[PDB]
Amino acid sequence: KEVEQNSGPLSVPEGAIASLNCTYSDRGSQSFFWYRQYSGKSPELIMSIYSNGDKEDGRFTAQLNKASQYVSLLIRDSQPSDSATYLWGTYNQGGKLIFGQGTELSVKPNIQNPDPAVYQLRDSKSSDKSVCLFTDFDSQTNVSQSKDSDVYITDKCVLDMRSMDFKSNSAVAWSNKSDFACANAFNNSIIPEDTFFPS
């Protein structure tokens, strides 16, 4: 719970192996548990380990090396739905429970057939705003907050239509300014050059 938790929010391609290794301190520790926590939800146990060795559970594998003093977790066949904050816990001889650094796992979804484009969505009789949708881009793209203070942008999200075996990324941008047009909406972001803009 201090410096040098391994830098960066771990990123992993869809379908690839994810390896989390955390070295610990108190030698008196001899029992470790893994917890998975989705963003605004509560943490939930997903793996227990007791002896110096390996333990398996479906796509998960948790390692414990008391010699080196490191607890690890491996997730095989990574799905985007695995994207969460993983954190290990232990019971030390002091009677108290300890939660070490919690790592953020980001499994980038595999976008089979990318079609980068920004569409302007129809106004609502009810609302005055205009909304621009930047969709179908590949997971190699990162969206950035807008430069203007009164044009809102939401980081990319992944939606899946089970029926069609289709996943698509997307980011929204809106504003009530007249300045605002879908062509300037995402300028502060490195979008593919092949990016489509209708009419």
């Binding site: 719970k1 029992s31 548990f33 917890y35 963003s39 605004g40 939800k41 509560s42 943490p43 939930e44 146990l45 227990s48 954190l87 816990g89 019971y91 009677g95 108290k96 429970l97 939660f99 919690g102 079609d115 484009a117 569409y119 302007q120 969505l121 129809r122 106004d123 609502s124 009810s126 609302s127 705003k129 909304v131 949708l133 969709t135 179908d136 809102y152 939401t154 980081d155 999200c157 992944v158 939606l159 899946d160 239509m161 089970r162 029926s163 069609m164 289709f166 698509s168 997307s170 929204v172 809106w174 489509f196 209708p198 009419s199």
Partner: protein, 241 residues
């Protein structure tokens, strides 16, 4: 499904008014502890109880108090609440081995004045004609804006039934005014369906946003409608090609 029970689940209060979040657990566990969670700080223990009438202050205990008269309950008392006690609280229970059972969490916001509480405005934006000819898929975008605190639940309903396939809601709200301590929030969600589905004028798309605001107990002197806990929606119907 036995679990730790936290009541209330959401709460807004004025600096000062004391409050107590209770925590129940029907699993006969002797161990219980409170945790607060903030962005960039992770989970931080506040207090913990190893057994009845046994109490010990965790890492960040100033401002909080607990009691363990019974094995089942381990309440959290804040005598004089403060803006920095605004956070996501969790209660946990531990028994066999040493595995933690977390309550669903409590979202507490301590604000200088209840005049800051606003409900969301919800609007639905229909699919682009461009996206339909180019993609043959239609994406609706629901926008929930100007709400405070950031306590919302959003969901899509098509023809009266909830929908999950093809929706993506932001994992967390956006601070409309990052630089403001009392900024209002925004949230967006996506609903994508085949272009065929969208063109049927008989199809009904409704966006549902549940806001957790004031209780019908809270006083209110302002002109605008009292920002109470409530559900706000917005819809659109299919449009023929």
């Amino acid at each position: 499904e036995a679990q730790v029970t936290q009541n209330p689940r959401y709460l807004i209060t004025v600096t000062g008014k004391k409050l107590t979040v209770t925590c129940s657990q029907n699993m006969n566990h002797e161990y219980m502890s409170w945790y607060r969670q903030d962005p960039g700080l992770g989970l931080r223990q506040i207090y913990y109880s190893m057994n009845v009438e046994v109490t010990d202050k965790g890492d960040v205990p100033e401002g909080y108090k607990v009691s363990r008269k019974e094995k089942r309950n381990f309440p959290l008392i804040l005598e004089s609440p403060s803006p920095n006690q605004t956070s996501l609280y969790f209660c946990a229970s531990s028994g066999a081995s040493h595995e933690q059972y977390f309550g669903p969490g409590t979202r507490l916001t301590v604000t200088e004045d209840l005049k800051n509480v606003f409900p969301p405005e919800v609007a639905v934006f229909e699919p682009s004609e461009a996206e339909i000819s180019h993609t043959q898929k239609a994406t609706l975008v629901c926008l929930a804006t100007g709400f405070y605190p950031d306590h919302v639940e959003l969901s899509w309903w098509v023809n009266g039934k909830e929908v999950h396939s093809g929706v993506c809601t932001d994992p967390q709200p956006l601070k409309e005014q990052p630089a403001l301590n009392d900024s209002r929030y925004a949230l967006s969600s996506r609903l994508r369906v085949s272009a065929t589905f969208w063109q049927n004028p008989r199809n009904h798309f409704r966006c549902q946003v549940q806001f957790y605001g004031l209780s019908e107990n809270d006083e209110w002197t302002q002109d605008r409608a009292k920002p109470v806990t409530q559900i706000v929606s917005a819809e659109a119907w299919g449009r023929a090609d």
